[PDB]
Amino acid sequence: AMEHMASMTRKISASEFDRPLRPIVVKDSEGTVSFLSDSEKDQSSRLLELVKDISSHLDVTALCHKIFLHIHGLISADRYSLFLVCEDSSNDKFLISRLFDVANNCIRLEWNKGIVGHVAALGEPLNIKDAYEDPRFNAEVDQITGYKTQSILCMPIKNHREEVVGVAQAINKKSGNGGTFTEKDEKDFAAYLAFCGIVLHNAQLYETSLLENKRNQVLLDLASLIFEEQQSLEVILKKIAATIISFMQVQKCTIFIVDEDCSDSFSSVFHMECEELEKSYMYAQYVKNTMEPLNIPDVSKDKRFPCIRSLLCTPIKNGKKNKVIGVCQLVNKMEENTGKVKPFNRNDEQFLEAFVIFCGLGIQNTQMYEAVERAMAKRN
Amino acid sequence: AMEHMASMTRKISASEFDRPLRPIVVKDSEGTVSFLSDGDQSSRLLELVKDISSHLDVTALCHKIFLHIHGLISADRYSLFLVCEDSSNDKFLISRLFDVAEGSTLEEVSNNCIRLEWNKGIVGHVAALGEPLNIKDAYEDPRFNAEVDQITGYKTQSILCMPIKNHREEVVGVAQAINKKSGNGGTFTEKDEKDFAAYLAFCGIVLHNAQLYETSLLENKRNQVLLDLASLIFEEQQSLEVILKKIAATIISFMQVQKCTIFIVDEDCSDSFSSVFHMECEELEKSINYMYAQYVKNTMEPLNIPDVSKDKRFPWQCIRSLLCTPIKNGKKNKVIGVCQLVNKMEENTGKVKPFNRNDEQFLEAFVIFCGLGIQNTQMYEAVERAMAKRN
């Protein structure tokens, strides 16, 4: 059945996965893909306590909650926040934050935008005496909310290779004499942070690893689908079609099956819109000829001639990876929080590159079944 | 070919998967099966901690920690032991990180590795209790083994042997200093006990993290193996015999058994056996005794027998260990064949041992794909028959 595919999508869809993953397949000289990828078998004393406390966490969430807490005790200030450098499969970085004092919700900040954006992208701290005199600052929010931002201390969090993995930020030094952020404030703050980077890195490596295995589990489940019943294309291609629309979050899928007997044609065709069933034209063509996936961000901007806005189109090769059994077409990657259409990325290629392998084997065994099938109603 | 398998095998050490792993599969709600789940020291201590903290590599981390404990207290030799646990859940310490007499050794790691059972020897027993030991004379210790001393002319006097714990207070290794350096012939301080321990408390956290990370890697590599095997056996589903040879070759290879036997249930008479396929590990690849098979088909549960002779349910170089498993069809309601492994082996020493949980986990997940494959191959053979009938 599908129903195996009911709460497939309750656990996941390919967008929890949109970060840099290890390559999902490795190819050799003569083009056997394998899945075996990456060969893989007092000041000081108060700081020691804090380190001891964070180091046990490989859950990024819990480790950020703890890092938030700590920074409160560390320099004295009105409002604190913590930012976490994220990154998707295209290697596009941004900042994220659910841990900010307002004094549920989730700030997202693009790479070089802002004070924090900037200290992020530059790996350099900002101690700002008076915000209203930094070009980089901007008082919209102060004014709207009636808060006034005097002093800022905004520090990069770095891992051991000294890459920025998030950012932390104190606003408005608590002070009698009316004071700015100290030099000792800067030092104490960076000292803590230099550890958070190393721990944060590790927690990120861990989760990436968990995510890489969750991927395998998805493929393994999808195999058990596909391979369930291999006695007719119309069935199987629907299963393939059905799943992919749901995991990949696209608007339509089309599978094209090369002619058994010529070698240049399209003996058959399937198509699903992203709700249900009606089954039974150029883009395939190119792929088949090229023997290579096709990602067009916008259709109307290429070397075809022109809704169908974003396209990814994948060759279904055969047992030996040689001929091209068939071809696979997805249109309009949506960002489906929204329904907003959107280009395909490496993540999307990787996953499909992978499912196509079983698709391959599924289809080419169905065909051999249907070829007996059809040597028997020639008795007809 | 199954050249592929040789190539996988070299990239894979059986030995490494011999530790507690999560199951490859999983039931949810009525049992539907599924892969998808759900002051100036304080200053120097920080520098050391900063340094170990970047290492999710257990090897490198151990190397770094060893090096570090030299600088900790003044003692003649040191060693570092690591708690391990295997698929059966038996624990034991090991060390390739042991100080020796200066100019004596081959390489340091000269291929060579102490290994103590869980609650045995000085370090064994510290592990098991989780309390440090500060002895002034090893020779007074009932658990001291003096052979090493005797064999090598070394004289061990004082030992500081201290458990390394993770944050949940589990022991993940043990570190010891032998023979306090001394211009006046001294023991190990209360103070000594306490610098050593400060540092070890971080070590246990980092190591525990590194262990966790290497488990996920191994959990992932297992699945990679499985995806590749699915590919193999789904490649050509037209000859039962083709696909069986593959299934068996595969098992014998990745599971290190002496014999594998697939019993296919007769399709019409659903309680004899149409065909039988047997491969022995010596490689040879061919097509009498049915009782384990019959049980499983009638039971429908895996059957795991640590030693066929010492076993009571079954009227009885031979046949020691048996793992043996139903193969089920697409809908998991019916049993189309059985898979029987004989004589799990220790990785070549060759010694025979029983199947553990890691073997059931793997076989359990493999035969899901075995079934799908065998059932779709029977289909193809069916129509092939159903066309030699008419034509």
The per-residue DSSP string of B245-273 comes to: HHHHHHHHHHH-EEEEEEEEEPSSSTTSE
Q: Which residues of A touch B201 (CB under 8 A)?
A: 52
Q: What is the SS3 assignment for A36?
A: coil
Instruction: Report yes or no: B377 and B240 within 8 Å, Cβ to Cβ.
Output: yes
The answer to whether the CB atoms of A35 and B228 lie below 8 A apart is yes
Residue A190: exposure state from Cβ atoms within 10 A (0-12, 13-18, ≥19): middle
Strand order in the sheet with B273-280: B284-286, B273-280, B257-265, B335-344, B322-328, B303-305
CA B77 to chain centre: 31
Q: Are B164 and B176 in contact (CB under 8 A)?
A: no
Three-state secondary structure along B286-355?
Answer: ECCCCHHHHHHHHHCCCEEECCCCCCCCCCCCCCCCEEEEEEECCCCCCEEEEEEEEEEECCCCCCECCC
Q: Distance between CA atoms of A366 and A378, rounded to whole angstroms?
A: 19
The reported resolution of this PDB entry, expressed in Å, is: 2.8
Extract the tokens encoding A118.
């900037």
Q: Residues of B numbered 260-319 whose beta carbons fall under 8 angstroms of chain A's beta carbons: which are they? A: none
Q: What 3-state DSSP class applies to B200?
A: helix
Cβ neighbours of residue A2 closer than 8 Å, sequence gap 6 or more: A239, A242
How many other C-beta atoms can be found within 10 angstroms of the C-beta atom of residue A234? Answer: 12
CATH 3.30.450.40 positions along chain B are 1-38+237-391, 39-236
Q: Do B369 and A227 touch (CB under 8 A)?
A: yes
> Which residues is A61 bridged to in the sheet?
none
Chain-centroid distance of CA B148 in Å reads 29
The radius of gyration computed from the CA coordinates of chain A, to the nearest angstrom, equals: 27
Task: Pick the residue of B231, B243, B384, B385 with the most A CBs within 10 A to test the interface with A by mutation.
Answer: B231
| A199–B53 C-beta distance less than 8 A | yes
Give me the residues of A, 337-366, that contact B with CB < 8 A. 357-358, 361-362, 365
Report, in angstroms and rounded to the nearest whole number, the Rg of chain B calculated over CA atoms.
27
Q: Where in chain A is the domain with CATH 3.30.450.40?
A: 1-40+230-380, 41-229
Residue A212: its chain B contacts at CB < 8 A? 220
Number of C-beta neighbours around residue B332 at 10 A: 14
User: What is the least distance, in Å, from the CA of B375 to any CA of chain A?
Assistant: 9
Nearest neighbour of A198 by CB, restricted to B43, B53, B201: B53
Please give the structure tokens belonging to residue B111. Answer: 């291929």
Contact A222, A358 (CB under 8 A): yes
| DSSP per position, A307-358 | ----EEEEEE--TTS-S--EEEEEE--B-TTS--B----HHHHHHHHHHHHH
Of the candidates B228, B235, B390, the beta carbon closest to that of A361 is on B235
Q: Which residues of A touch B56 (CB under 8 A)?
A: 202, 205-206
The answer to whether B51 and B64 are in contact (CB under 8 A) is yes
Structure tokens, A372: 């007996």
Among the listed residues B9, B16, B130, B22, the one whose alpha carbon sits nearest the alpha carbon of residue B361: B22
Domain B1-38+237-391: CATH architecture, name and number where available = 2-Layer Sandwich (3.30)
A44 neighbourhood in chain B, CB within 8 Å: 39, 42-43, 45-46
Cα gap A239→A8, rounded to integer Å: 13
Q: Tokens 């699903």 identify what position?
A: A272
DSSP 8-class letter at B282: T
**Neighbour count for residue A314 (Cβ, 10 Å):** 24
Residue (of B93, B75, B70) closest to B157 by Cα position: B75
The three-state secondary structure class of B194 is helix
d(CA B320, CA B309): 7
Sign of the torsion angle spanned by Cα atoms B251, B252, B258, B262 = positive
| Cross-strand pairs, B161 | B133, B176
Q: Which contacts qualify for B164-170: CB closer than 8 Å, 24 or more apart? A: B164/B200, B164/B203, B164/B204, B164/B207, B165/B130, B165/B200, B165/B201, B165/B204, B166/A56, B166/B204, B166/B205, B166/B207, B166/B208, B167/A56, B167/B204, B167/B205, B167/B208, B169/B130, B170/B208
Q: List the strands of the sheet with A252-258, edge to edge.
A: A266-273, A252-258, A326-331, A311-316, A294-296
CA B278 remoteness from chain centre? 27
Distances (CA, A) of B165 to A202, A298, A306, A327, B174: 19, 56, 66, 55, 9
B39-236 folds as Beta-Lactamase (3.30.450)
- The CA distance from B165 to the nearest CA of chain A, in Å, is 12
Q: Do B383 and A373 touch (CB under 8 A)?
A: yes
Burial of B32 (0-12, 13-18, 19+ CB in 10 A): exposed
Tokens 């992208």 label which residue? A121
Among all residues of chain B, which has the CA nearest to that of A59?
Answer: B209
Question: H-helix or E-strand containing B192?
Answer: helix B192-233
Alpha helices by DSSP H, chain A: 43-54, 60-72, 114-122, 140-145, 183-226, 233-248, 283-290, 346-376
Helix A43-54 / helix A183-226 crossing angle, nearest 10 deg: 10
Closest chain A residue by Cα to residue B22: A213
Cα B270 → chain centroid: 38
For chain A positions 14-33, those within 8 Å of chain B (CB to CB) are 32
The token pair at A303 is 């070397």
Task: Specify whether the CB–CB gap between B261 and B63 falls below 8 A.
Answer: no
Chain B touched by A375 (CB under 8 Å): yes
Q: Judge: A11–B38 Cβ closer than 8 Å, yes or no.
A: yes
Residues of B in contact with A373 (CB under 8 A): 383
Distance CA B82, CA B113 (A): 11
Measured from the Cβ of residue A256, the count of other Cβ atoms closer than 10 Å reads: 24
H or E element at residue A169: strand A164-173
Output the CATH code of domain A41-229: 3.30.450.40
State the best of A3, A4, A48, A205 to mutate against chain B, taking most chain B CBs within 10 Å. A48
Spatial separation of the C-alpha atoms in residues A270 and A256, rounded to whole Å: 7
Phi, psi angles (nearest 5°) of residue B35: -85, -30
User: CATH class for domain A1-40+230-380?
Assistant: alpha beta
Name the phi and psi angles at B255, rounded to 5: -115, -10
Please report, as a single letter, which amino acid is at residue A193: L
Contact call for A217 and B167, based on CB within 8 A: no
Yes or no, beta carbons of A58 and B212 under 8 Å apart: yes
Q: How far is CA A164 from CA A29, A155, A158, A190, A207, in A?
A: 38, 10, 4, 13, 18
Indicate the helix (H) or strand (E) that contains A271: strand A266-273
Our measurement of the distance from residue B370's CA atom to the centroid of its chain's CA atoms, rounded to an integer in Å, reads 24
Q: Could you tell me the two tokens for A54? A: 């964070």
**Sign of the torsion angle spanned by Cα atoms B272, B274, B280, B281:** negative
Tell me the nearest-neighbour CA distance from A135 into chain B, angstroms: 36
DSSP B139: G
A223–B227: do the CB atoms touch at under 8 Å? Answer: yes
What is the C-alpha end-to-end distance of chain A, expressed in Å?
A: 32
CB pairs under 8 A between A and B: 182
End-to-end CA distance of chain B: 34
Strand partners, B324: B303, B340
Reading the block at residue B57, the tokens are: 């590599």
Interface of B with A in 44-63 (CB under 8 A): 45-46, 49-50, 53-54, 56
CA–CA min distance A86, chain B (Å): 20
Cβ of B89: how many Cβ atoms within 10 Å? 10
Cβ–Cβ gap B209/A319 under 8 Å: no
Across the interface, of A47, A201, A227, the residue whose CB is closest to B46 is A47
Distance CA A80, CA A95 (A): 16
Interface of B with A in 161-200 (CB under 8 A): 166-167
Query: Are the CB atoms for A257 and A326 separated by under 8 Å?
Result: yes
Q: Which of B56, B330, B368 comes nearest A202 by C-beta?
A: B56
Residue B202: closest C-alpha in chain A:
A52
The helix (run of H) or strand (run of E) holding residue B127 is helix B121-129
